[PDB]
């Protein structure tokens, strides 16, 4: 019955393949748009970067402290 | 000795004993068909319809084939817009032979 086993419907999606033909849908950079940082290989901005504006986690003050008794 | 009749949304001019390839019908491949919708009948004498669809004229035909038409390829292409599409079509047809032409 090895040639009869099948997976449950919806268990697989086959993944998305980028830049393979016209009718595959997402070709031509595979759904990352035109020029920019996102279009380049290895591009993107680090976490919390706001385009040079001061990040929220830097604008807000830090407060409180860690209690060791709470850990034990 | 020929008649003009409306069958599949388009007039056909068929003489007696001739095979006419018209659009698909819901008839069997070995079954006679009814065409009471005759627009004009011509003979040695001239007879024309005073009212659409004659008065008693009828066409008797026997269905012979129910095949599909020649392949037609539809290609849609947009210049420089990264869009290309292809499609195929094979229209159904019903070929019939006119066995009788009334008056």
UniProtKB/Swiss-Prot annotation, chain A:
Start-end of Gly residues biased regions: 20-30
UniProt-listed GO biological process terms: cytoplasmic translation
GO MF term set: rRNA binding; structural constituent of ribosome
GO cellular component assignments: cytoplasm; cytosolic large ribosomal subunit
Family affiliation: Belongs to the universal ribosomal protein uL15 family.
Record note on quaternary structure: Part of the 50S ribosomal subunit. Contacts the 5S rRNA.
Function: This protein binds the 5S rRNA. It is required for the late stages of subunit assembly, and is essential for 5S rRNA assembly onto the ribosome.
Protein name in the entry: Large ribosomal subunit protein uL15
Organism whose genome encodes this protein: Escherichia coli (strain K12)
Parent-record interval covered: 2 to 73 of 144
Curated annotation (Swiss-Prot), chain B:
SUPFAM superfamilies for the chain: L21p-like
PROSITE patterns in UniProt: RIBOSOMAL_L21
A Gene Ontology cellular-component term: cytoplasm
Any one Gene Ontology molecular-function term assigned to this protein's record: structural constituent of ribosome
GO terms for biological process, alphabetical: cytoplasmic translation
Disulfide bond annotation, renumbered to this chain: none
Sorted UniProt keywords: Ribonucleoprotein, Ribosomal protein, RNA-binding, rRNA-binding
Transmembrane domains' residue ranges: none
PANTHER family given in the database record: 50S RIBOSOMAL PROTEIN L21 (PTHR21349), LARGE RIBOSOMAL SUBUNIT PROTEIN BL21M (PTHR21349:SF0)
Subunit structure: Part of the 50S ribosomal subunit. Contacts protein L20.
Homology family: Belongs to the bacterial ribosomal protein bL21 family.
HAMAP family named among the record's database cross-references: Ribosomal_bL21
Primary role: This protein binds to 23S rRNA in the presence of protein L20.
Protein name: Large ribosomal subunit protein bL21
Organism of origin: Escherichia coli (strain K12)
């Amino acid at each position: 019955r090895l040639n009869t086993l099948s997976p449950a419907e919806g268990s697989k999606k086959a993944g998305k393949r980028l830049g393979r033909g016209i009718g595959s849908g997402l070709g031509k950079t595979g759904g990352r748009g035109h020029k920019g940082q996102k279009s380049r290989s290895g591009g993107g901005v680090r976490r919390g970067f706001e385009g040079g504006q001061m990040p929220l986690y830097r604008r807000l003050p830090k407060f409180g402290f860690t209690s060791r008794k709470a850990a034990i | 000795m020929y008649a003009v009749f409306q069958s599949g949304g388009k007039q056909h001019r068929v003489s007696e004993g001739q095979t006419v390839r018209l659009e698909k019908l819901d008839i069997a491949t070995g079954e006679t068909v009814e065409f009471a919708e005759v627009l004009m009948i011509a003979n040695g004498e001239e007879v024309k319809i005073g009212v659409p669809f004659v008065d008693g004229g009828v066409i008797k035909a026997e269905v012979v084939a129910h095949g599909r038409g020649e392949k037609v390829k539809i290609v849609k292409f947009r210049r420089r817009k990264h869009y290309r599409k292809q499609q195929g079509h094979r229209q159904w047809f019903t070929d019939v032979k006119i066995t009788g032409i009334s008056a």
